[PDB]
Design a protein around this ligand. Structure first.
Ligand code: CL
Ligand code: CL
Length: 162
């Protein structure tokens, strides 16, 4: 198991535009298109992203391609983030995957706000951080997914995804 596979399970895969859990237009593997309520706006972002007149449908290859960019951008956002980098540096391989997922789902900015959990992760206080990560809108809105990520931080294994 790895980051790709992990996120592939959490976001699923869709070839037509759809609305995420917060109601925003997305496509492929959790690729957010726009927060705008406009479908056109979304089709436009899509075409721009793919480089062709898609008409709201892409192929599996295009999907995967966006997916790779999105993963790369996420690591990259972590590495550039003054609050994130240190955390990420301190963690083992499995747990890093967990931080990346969170970043992917919520943006670097979203993640950097978990100051307190971040601190705990850095100190390797596993059970404590898990409890703190849980007191969040994030956990309340997408609890199953959040449970997966948290277990991951807690145990440092992939058990939650097997
Ligand atoms: Cl893009
Ligand atoms: Cl969920």
């Amino acid at each position: 198991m790895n980051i790709f596979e992990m996120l592939r399970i959490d976001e699923g895969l869709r070839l037509k535009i759809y609305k995420d859990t917060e109601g925003y237009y997305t496509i492929g593997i959790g690729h957010l298109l726009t927060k705008s309520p406009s479908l056109n706006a979304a089709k436009s972002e899509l075409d721009k992203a793919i480089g062709r007149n898609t008409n709201g449908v892409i192929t599996k290859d295009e999907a995967e391609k966006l997916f790779n960019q999105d993963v790369d951008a996420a690591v990259r956002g972590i590495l550039r983030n003054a609050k994130l980098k240190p955390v990420y540096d301190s963690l083992d391989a499995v747990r890093r995957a967990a931080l990346i997922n969170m970043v992917m789902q919520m943006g670097e900015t979203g993640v950097a706000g978990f100051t307190n959990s971040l601190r705990m992760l850095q100190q390797k206080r596993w059970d404590e951080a898990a409890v703190n990560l849980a007191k969040s809108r994030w956990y309340n809105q997408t609890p199953n997914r959040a449970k997966r990520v948290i277990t991951t931080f807690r145990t440092g294994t992939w058990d939650a995804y097997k």
